[PDB]
Amino acid sequence: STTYKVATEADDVVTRVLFDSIAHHFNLEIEYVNYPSFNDILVAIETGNADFAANITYTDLRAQRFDFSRPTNIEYTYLYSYGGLRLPELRLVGIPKGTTYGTLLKEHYPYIQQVEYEGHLEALTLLESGRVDGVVDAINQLKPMLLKGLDVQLLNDQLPIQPVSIVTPKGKHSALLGKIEKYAHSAHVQRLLRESIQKYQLDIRKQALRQSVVESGLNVQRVLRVKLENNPQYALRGISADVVFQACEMLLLKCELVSNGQETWESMFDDLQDKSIDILAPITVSQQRKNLAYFSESYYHPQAILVKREHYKDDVYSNVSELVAERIGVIKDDFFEELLQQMLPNKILFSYASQEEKVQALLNKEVDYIVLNRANFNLLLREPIVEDTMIGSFYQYDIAIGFAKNPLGATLAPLFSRAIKMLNTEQIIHTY
Amino acid sequence: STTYKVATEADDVVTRVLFDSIAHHFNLEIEYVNYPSFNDILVAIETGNADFAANITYTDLRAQRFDFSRPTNIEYTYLYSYGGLRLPELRLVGIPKGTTYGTLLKEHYPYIQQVEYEGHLEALTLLESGRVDGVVDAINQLKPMLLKGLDVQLLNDQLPIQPVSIVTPKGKHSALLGKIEKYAHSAHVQRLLRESIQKYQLDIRKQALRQSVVESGLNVQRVLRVKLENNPQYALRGISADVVFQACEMLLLKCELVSNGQETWESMFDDLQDKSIDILAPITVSQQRKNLAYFSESYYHPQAILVKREHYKDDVYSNVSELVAERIGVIKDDFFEELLQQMLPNKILFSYASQEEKVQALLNKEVDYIVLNRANFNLLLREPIVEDTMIGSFYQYDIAIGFAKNPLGATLAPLFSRAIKMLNTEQIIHTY
Ligand SMILES: NC(=[NH2+])NCCC[C@H](N)C(=O)O
Ligand SMILES: NC(=[NH2+])NCCC[C@H](N)C(=O)O
């Protein structure tokens, strides 16, 4: 009889889940050993004070110090920061020593400078009131870090985070590592690692978020009134509804979608300025509108394109500045009218009351090019003209949630920004 | 009788072309007045020492100092630099004073710092052996600047360069400015401004480029032998042929495309290492290949995606790191094999001899996901499976022209980089 020592750093939930599963499947005596730092773990392995460790990114240098299994799983990787910053917002970043993260951040953000640390306390003091703007580290730090009032941004869908593997003192547990490898790749264990870990970390992040709601002292018994824009403009029970509602679920607030008939002349934004509703989306955050409501961070980025009569002047123009003498149709007070007024200063635009009228103008040769957002233009075709691929997307703008300009909305909007971050927006967008 | 004074700065070819055209059409006595600086021109206008000026970007502040016509034309705008740098490569940039360029560069590249100058000599000394890395200025500077051995990058398809207009002392030539405006927008004059100016500046840039060929001292009587990759891999008489051939035209070298049958086992790269041909494209600049040939700058950026059996495991995985236990098929020694070996370290990939065999493996359920480049995958469908939109483009890589590793190729490759810059690649790509 014996005992296999497997290394752990901080809250090593994947090492626990994986090796409990293995311990039990092969009837193995596992013994977890806490190491105060990830690089402590690495020395333990090549040395031999520990038999196994997980979550180690394989490298060519590394395979010459101790022996690797093939990658067994992903590793959730976060930017920890007071406020929830992004990578391209930092000039200092804390970096766990010995990790693959040194190379990753200099390869993708070489200007930031890294400051090395050892373990959670060191990381925590660097952040906890220090010079470091943010720390990049694994799921091991999530639970203790969010306790200390920190926020995260999941980096795995932001950067190519390499898969991860189980490792062993070189030439040591060769046969056992093989069996462990083959078991880990099984349909069962893989399905278990995907879901339980995702569930595990999303729950910690929800709890932190929900504690913020409570700390905000807003009345969660209040039914938030929501309106969705249904005047042909930019987007919509689709992308916007899912983001708003699921964010409302993220925060354990109750939201109710409300409608009448409206709107083409009965603006919902008026309802928002009335304070007769609390939330309105989508809203494309113009300049005109920027001050009349509070805004969540963006959650979609529409592609402005030009719609032209088919077969008309193809490849004559390669970008919209060369339309100096073409007739461009926009809708009055619409965001695209503003856009062109910046982009093509002092130029005559032709204004219309509606998309319908805007389109019919193009068809009647009243006008030659009209401004639409791509996704909306594809929609119209499904339910005789086309896009000028040459010019193509001449602009990318922002869609956000708007909140009524009062104290409640001031508190809601930053909260909704976080709920949106934690969402899988890409999936929703695809769906539609 | 009288005389209208219209302002000019340096080689103001658009002011000449436009106002000659107007002078003649309305029977007007024009008198050009050289101003040593663009901001000299502006003061002349609001003052009244000059009756007209062109190429002035309209602004809200500006319209309160002198009066604007509506935009009449675009303005070719260049980064001037020793070597031909790009904006995101500079920490210092020279900026003409009074221009719209101050605002444009800080809005798109705030980190660079601007250093103001007055006129071509000032600009030229800043560049000519100075601290400035590069100057951003209009077509006015093109001919004198390229004389002084400078290179350009056309910024108009790089940045939103606002259209441009004719301007006048405030409340002065009101009626005449109207007639001038309406004439300029005419089908005729517009067509004249598009083509003659484009022709004019492309010729100056060709001449500079061709002088470089001559200065290189390479034998332009030599017929360069070119091969195009025709083993299913990344791209191809299409994108690559147009870029290579038209670049060959750009440089007044003679290139001849050569083929046999080959190649799936008879690599053209071997022909390149043989020195039996001079040029090979496309070639996706791996690491494996990076040192065996000289490479032009990239001219296309393929989208690596995963091809999967239809209806199989949709939305189970959102990026390729989560394929740790899926069977991925690549071609042996292919670029994608290398890619995955970086991206999914120490993981078993299944290797094949060909695309054909790779595909049939996916169909035979030998394998579950295979790596293709998007454009190539669309091709196959046209002449039962699909892409995993969820993962989507998990990588963007580079396509370049490769040149044989000898002195001639060492000279050709940098030259071909310039010829490619001056090309309209977007148009070619579209076409295909
Ligand atoms: N205890 C940890 N998982 N620390 C982070 C490790 C990061 C990365 N997987 C590496 O081995 O370089
Ligand atoms: N002579 C010139 N065109 N100088 C550049 C002017 C740049 C820009 N059109 C402006 O008026 O601000």
Numbering used by the authors:
A (entry chain A), B (entry chain A): 48 to 283, 291 to 437, 443 to 491
Text lifted from the article:
C-di-GMP is synthesized from guanosine triphosphate by diguanylate cyclase (DGC) enzymes and hydrolyzed to 5′-phosphoguanylyl-(3′ → 5′)-guanosine by c-di-GMP-specific phosphodiesterases (PDEs). CdgH also plays a major role in c-di-GMP synthesis by responding to the presence of bile acids. Here, we reported the crystal structure of the periplasmic portion of V. Cholerae CdgH. Our structure indicated that both tandem PBPb domains of CdgH contain a typical interlobe ligand-binding structural architecture.
